[PDB]
Amino acid sequence: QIITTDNTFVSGNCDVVIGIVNNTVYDPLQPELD
Amino acid sequence: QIITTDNTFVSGNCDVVIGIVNNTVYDPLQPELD
Ligand SMILES: *[C@@H]1O[C@H](CO)[C@@H](O)[C@H](O)[C@H]1NC(C)=O
Numbered sequence A, B: 001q002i003i004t005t006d007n008t009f010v011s012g013n014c015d016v017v018i019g020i021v022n023n024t025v026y027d028p029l030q031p032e033l034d
């Protein structure tokens, strides 16, 4: 599935997590823009 | 964590619940104003 904010939650910054990577998390409210 | 709509679900009115208090729930779409 596409990485979305529906099945992902945010918790703190990425500096404390070992072995993290970078990729875009698609917010579905952005293509709507209603 | 701050009380947000993502981690709470609503079921009926608050007249039936015993010992319930009043507090604000943060709507995350309201500061977005999309
Ligand atoms: C992710 O991006 C930040 C900021 O551009 C960078 O400092 C970090 O090294 C990146 N992560 C990786 C694994 O390259």
Ligand SMILES: *[C@@H]1O[C@H](CO)[C@@H](O)[C@H](O)[C@H]1NC(C)=O
Pocket (backbone or CB within 6 Å): B021, B022
């Ligand atoms: C909570 O709100 C209800 C309805 O406005 C009110 O009757 C009640 O006294 C309030 N309780 C507190 C602790 O403010």
